[PDB]
Design a protein around this ligand. Structure first.
Ligand SMILES: NC(=O)c1ccc[n+]([C@@H]2O[C@H](COP(=O)([O-])OP(=O)(O)OC[C@H]3O[C@@H](n4cnc5c(N)ncnc54)[C@H](O)[C@@H]3O)[C@@H](O)[C@H]2O)c1
Ligand SMILES: NC(=O)c1ccc[n+]([C@@H]2O[C@H](COP(=O)([O-])OP(=O)(O)OC[C@H]3O[C@@H](n4cnc5c(N)ncnc54)[C@H](O)[C@@H]3O)[C@@H](O)[C@H]2O)c1
Lengths: 332, 332
């Protein structure tokens, strides 16, 4: 019944995984352990209080070597040292952000987790999964997999619906994105010259791999999409601004309706929509991968089309980590 | 030699027109009077200290009901009563944002002014101008003209180099925009449901008529463009994100090269470029109508294009308001 997980790296997403599990009321995932090299006390405190997501819904105590909500806490620099065999770990959730590589993440297999799921694109991933779109391809042949990114998780279901309805010849994606943890509050030394500037002071153009990735989850679209991002001064919630050329002449109503159909049918709980005049903060804490904004569909001359699609880049994705982990457990 | 102007509405744009003249040290324009809703002293203080632009780069003395840096100051909310005739005002600069309409704006000529320049699209305008693109179309047969908008002024030059080079089949523009003073700090009653929302708290989609206005000033693109805006938590500096189908199979290098040329040659001082990895605040107080970001140009299969174009929605426009005022004054 219950799939035994361990969270490696108790950072935003790791904590958000936990919170998604408790909030949703789901009973199919047991969080057996967490690993992180900072204080156990500090970890519980960050779980308790979040500036974006509010108070933990429940009580949070540190008792001995565990956090009671009863989750064992570990501190290993080297994931291969974790007692995953002893703890009968089904799926290790790699969340630290520094072991995204398949080479690197396979350390949890060494430690005795039966499978690994990386909360980010993974280099040499056995499979990159956008739950609700391609998780059905998961099988005994896959041991270390990627959950894609928040952005990929948003763009793909929408891509799919559009391609099925009007066909996408080519498309360009700009994601207007909230600042993330790898950005600094003030200008400072960095791997990337864009992301080195004060995060809450500018619109910052930056790179995203999501459009290429949608080329893989949906092989019909390989090489037909590219994409970039613009980071702006909001702490959470992002949006895909997609312009594409359609293979057949179409309308706003045509596109909106295929979205409503998909959202009400086979992508229920992955894709949603709004006919209301909403702004980014209204999607904060929404669990969908994508929420399509009907108001914003525009179509020039029946063939050049633009859509706008919100996503809580933390909350959507963390709920997807749960679904992917459960679907993945069934192939063990 | 000099052009006599009166500024109606010493608001963000009213005051920045005045700073623009002072900073450039242009002697071709003389501010004779200004009108605003409130104090003589408050207008002085606001001019002195600007949260976005910094110290007013001279001295501002209150003296009588006049400001010395000598300009006379009024406070009649009704424009019809102000005495432009006996002040010999060549061109009036309607800058309030509430007499945008031509039928309304034509008051300044009743109240004596020889010509009128609305800082903002207008309804029944004799001619809508983007300086550096279409100003040589101004004739004696024009009394009340429109300076267009910040966004119109930045798309139009770029559309021109693009079209005239590679041809625009169809185009969709998103502007990512700094908040403006028609938005509030907190959610509150507004004629528009998006713009009612707390302005530094969300990305906020909104309508702009700039794409359409570009189709009228560049007649060749009548109804070939559409656009929207997303307001984000920055206080100044916006950007154009343009996706379009090009008539000719093209490249990035080719796109940026054409922009180099327009920048150095015929659009010098209106259009500039950058090859550097810059972010929005690096373009604060830049006087250009458009600054092209090379790095950011993308082309899919040689046909679907994307460019990114910065603009100081306050400083660029306010300088054009000066250049327009001058070119207009010559048809008198
Ligand atoms: N948050 C989002 O918006 C989002 C969306 C999609 C994908 N992702 C992906 O998820 C991953 C994590 O993102 P995040 O926002 O949670 O960042 P985060 O920095 O808040 O999380 C990283 C956590 O791992 C811990 N850590 C670092 N090194 C460690 C080590 N050697 N051993 C154990 N723990 C270690 C840190 O203490 C921290 O708690 C990233 O790779 C990112 O690509 C994030
Ligand atoms: N600021 C920008 O980014 C930008 C860009 C392009 C165009 N514009 C246009 O410039 C115009 C002015 O906008 P702004 O940025 O100055 O905003 P603002 O509200 O700061 O300026 C308007 C000023 O006029 C005054 N005013 C209001 N009603 C008046 C009345 N009845 N009589 C006399 N004075 C009155 C107000 O006190 C205020 O100071 C707008 O129409 C806007 O569309 C602005």
């Amino acid at each position: 019944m219950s799939v035994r997980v361990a969270i490696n790296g108790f950072g935003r997403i790791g904590r958000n995984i936990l919170r998604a599990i408790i909030e949703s009321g789901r009973q199919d995932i047991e969080v057996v352990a967490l690993n992180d090299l900072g204080s156990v006390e500090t970890n519980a405190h960050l779980l308790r209080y979040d500036s974006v997501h509010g108070c933990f819904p429940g009580t949070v105590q540190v008792v001995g070597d565990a956090i009671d909500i009863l989750i064992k806490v570990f501190a290993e620099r080297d994931p291969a040292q974790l007692p995953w065999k002893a703890l009968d770990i089904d799926i290790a959730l790699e969340c630290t952000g520094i072991f995204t590589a398949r080479d690197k993440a396979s350390a949890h297999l060494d430690a005795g987790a039966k499978r690994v799921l990386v909360s980010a694109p993974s280099e040499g991933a056995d499979l990159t999964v956008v739950y609700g779109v391609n998780h059905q391809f998961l099988s005994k042949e896959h041991h270390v997999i990627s959950n894609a990114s928040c952005t990929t998780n948003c763009l793909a279901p929408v891509a799919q619906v559009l391609h099925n309805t009007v066909g996408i010849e080519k498309g360009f994606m700009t994601t207007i994105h909230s600042y993330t943890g790898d950005q600094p509050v003030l200008d400072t030394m960095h791997r990337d010259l864009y992301r080195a500037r004060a995060a809450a002071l500018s619109m910052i153009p930056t790179s995203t791999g999501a459009a290429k990735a949608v080329g893989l989850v949906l092989p019909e679209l390989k090489g037909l999409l590219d994409g970039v991002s613009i980071r702006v001064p909001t702490p959470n919630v992002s949006v895909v601004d997609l312009t594409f050329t359609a293979k057949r002449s179409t309308t706003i109503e045509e596109i909106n309706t295929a979205i409503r159909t998909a959202a009400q049918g086979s992508l229920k709980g992955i894709l949603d929509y709004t006919d209301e005049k909403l702004v980014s903060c209204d999607f904060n804490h929404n669990p969908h991968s994508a929420i399509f904004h009907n108001d914003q569909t525009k179509v020039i001359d029946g063939q050049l089309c633009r859509v706008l699609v919100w996503y809580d880049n933390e909350w959507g994705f963390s709920n997807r980590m749960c679904d992917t982990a459960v679907a993945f457990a069934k192939t063990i």
